[PDB]
Amino acid sequence: CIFEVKHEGKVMGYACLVGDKVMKPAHVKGTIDNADLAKLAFKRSSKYDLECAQIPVHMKSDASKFTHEKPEGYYNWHHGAVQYSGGRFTIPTGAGKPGDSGRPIFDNKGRVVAIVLGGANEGARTALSVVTWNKDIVTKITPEGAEEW
Amino acid sequence: CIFEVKHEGKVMGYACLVGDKVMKPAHVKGTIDNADLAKLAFKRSSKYDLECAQIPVHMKSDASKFTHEKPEGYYNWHHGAVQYSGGRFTIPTGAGKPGDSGRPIFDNKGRVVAIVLGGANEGARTALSVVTWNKDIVTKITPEGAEEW
Numbered sequence: 001c002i003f004e005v006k007h008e009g010k011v012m013g014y015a016c017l018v019g020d021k022v023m024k025p026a027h028v029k030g031t032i033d034n035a036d037l038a039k040l041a042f043k044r045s046s047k048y049d050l051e052c053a054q055i056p057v058h059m060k061s062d063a064s065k066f067t068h069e070k071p072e073g074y075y076n077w078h079h080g081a082v083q084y085s086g087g088r089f090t091i092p093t094g095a096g097k098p099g100d101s102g103r104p105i106f107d108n109k110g111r112v113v114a115i116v117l118g119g120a121n122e123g124a125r126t127a128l129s130v131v132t133w134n135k136d137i138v139t140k141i142t143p144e145g146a147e148e149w
Numbered sequence: 150c151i152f153e154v155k156h157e158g159k160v161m162g163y164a165c166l167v168g169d170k171v172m173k174p175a176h177v178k179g180t181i182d183n184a185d186l187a188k189l190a191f192k193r194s195s196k197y198d199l200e201c202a203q204i205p206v207h208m209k210s211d212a213s214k215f216t217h218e219k220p221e222g223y224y225n226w227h228h229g230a231v232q233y234s235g236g237r238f239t240i241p242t243g244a245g246k247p248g249d250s251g252r253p254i255f256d257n258k259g260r261v262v263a264i265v266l267g268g269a270n271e272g273a274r275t276a277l278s279v280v281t282w283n284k285d286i287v288t289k290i291t292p293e294g295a296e297e298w
Contacts, residue, residue, distance in 0.1 A: 035158035 001064040005030040013102025017063040026051040067111040089128040118148035150213040154179040163251025166212040175200040216260040238277040267297035
């Protein structure tokens with residue numbers, strides 16, 4: 001379900017097969033490192049900083065079902081455990097660097113909860129700037145002073 | 150000797166190095182997935198639904214011979230053993246599917262005897278539609294109701 005966006009042979013962010021679309025943050029430079037995915041036609045959406053397309057039939061079995069459901073507590077991401085509370089995702093400062101955009105923040109059942117875009121350093125912890133689902137629609141939470149990763 | 154034709158990153162058919170030419174069915178969309186082969190100049194022939202070119206000197210050692218000599222009996226092909234009789238090649242129905250075109254039918258000494266183009270389902274067995282060599286010249290045998298693979 002997770003695929004990596006490469007730019008000049010360098011991983012910039014990620015792409016994800018959620019629902020029946022193929023997502024990847026709009027701000028991420030590069031092209032999905034997967035033939036089938038790379039040749040697709042994406043529809044950009046600057047409001048959501050999202051850029052979706054449709055999953056080829058032969059990969060649709062590979063999608064992951066997202067969720068608006070996110071109760072205060074700890075979430076999972078590649079570098080460790082993210083913490084959600086006060087309507088804000090945070091992590092120990094240093095555990096997220098430029099080149100981590102696109103990486104999903106899963107919950108314990110695998111549902112993608114948000115997609116990292118960058119983070120604002122506020123000391124001990126960094127408030128993440130993410131793309132998250134609302135009641136049904138996409139949204140973007142960007143803490144004051146975020147540094148786009 | 151066998152090379153695959155790709156189209157939008159998807160295998161459509163095959164290409165084969167037979168004799169001193171490089172073959173691939175004309176109807177197959179895409180370009181041979183091999184630098185040396187892809188840059189060649191092919192001569193189309195709509196009668197034979199064939200599209201040949203000449204094998205670069207550095208690959209000529211990689212060709213597969215051929216022969217007009219084909220006595221009734223069993224021949225060899227990737228999925229098993231083909232049967233020749235009554236001037237017709239056949240196989241157990243189900244053992245050949247779309248995407249098998251281009252695959253050669255060898256004999257027991259390795260000489261390519263025919264090249265599969267598609268097959269007509271006539272029950273228990275399917276009569277193959279092949280490109281075969283006559284006295285010296287190429288020919289195409291297409292059983293009634295063939296389904297072009």
